[PDB]
Amino acid sequence: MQGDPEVIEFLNEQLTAELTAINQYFLHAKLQDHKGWTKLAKYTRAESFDEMRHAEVLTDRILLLDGLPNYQRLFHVRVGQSVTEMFQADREVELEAIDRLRRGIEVMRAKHDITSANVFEAILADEEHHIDYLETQLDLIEKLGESLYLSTVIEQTQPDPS
């Protein structure tokens, strides 16, 4: 039971993209946390955890196919100062991810392999949901005003009592 080499390379590329997503999301979460912004930090921390779960399932599937996952390669990492650059870079990486997912799902369904294809469209759906969230928040910050919007994520108003 050996998979095709193109299947292995597609899984490896997706795994590399997931690792880059993990690193970028964690570094961002730390940046917003240091800036003091709380809700953004916790939401992106949850997003990073979800990406780690995706990496888990992908590496299990590729390991079952009798392959050697490569944990050495990593794509480029982008950092900015304001929230707009955060959202723009995240949108870019998710867009390239969706393109790769669509190509991979098409070819995988073409070349008689399904379970890998199934986890492919699962990751596809999750990432398209994340893109929708990112796009709607980008629109909201564009319309609302940067300072006025950021007045929302930060609040010290005794949240402990409940």
In the complex, the smallest distance separating the C-beta of residue 49 from a second copy, rounded to whole angstroms, is 9
Which of the residues 88 through 117 are near a second copy (CB under 8 A)? 102, 105-106, 112, 114-115
99 contacts 123 by C-beta, under 8 angstroms: no
Q: Which is nearer to Fe ion, 83 or 93 (CB)?
A: 93
In the complex, the smallest distance separating the C-beta of residue 76 from Fe ion, rounded to whole angstroms, is 15
Q: Does 6 bind a second copy (CB under 8 A)?
A: no
Q: Does 81 bind a second copy (CB under 8 A)?
A: no
The correct pick among 8, 11, 21, 40 for binding Fe ion (CB under 5 A) is 21
Q: Residues 47-66: x/- map of binding to Fe ion (CB under 5 A)?
A: --x-xx-x------------
What Rg value do the Cα atoms of the chain yield, rounded? 18
In 3D space, the residue among 18, 39, 26, 51 whose CA is nearest the CA of residue 137 turns out to be: 39
Cα(55)–Cα(45) distance, integer angstroms:
15
Q: What is the DSSP secondary structure assignment for residue 36, as one 8-state letter?
A: T
**With b meaning 16 or more CB within 10 Å and e meaning fewer, what string describes 78-100?**
beeeebeebbebbeebbeebbeb
Q: Does 132 bind a second copy (CB under 8 A)?
A: yes
The residues near 138 (Cβ < 8 Å, ≥ 6 apart) are 84, 87, 88, 91
Length, in residues, of the chain: 162
Residue 66 one-letter amino acid: D
Binding residues vs a second copy (CB under 8 A): 1, 23-24, 26-27, 30-31, 34-36, 38-40, 42-43, 45-46, 59-60, 63-64, 68-69, 71-72, 74, 76-77, 79, 102, 105-106, 112, 114-115, 118, 121, 124-125, 128, 131-132, 135-137, 140, 143-145, 147-162
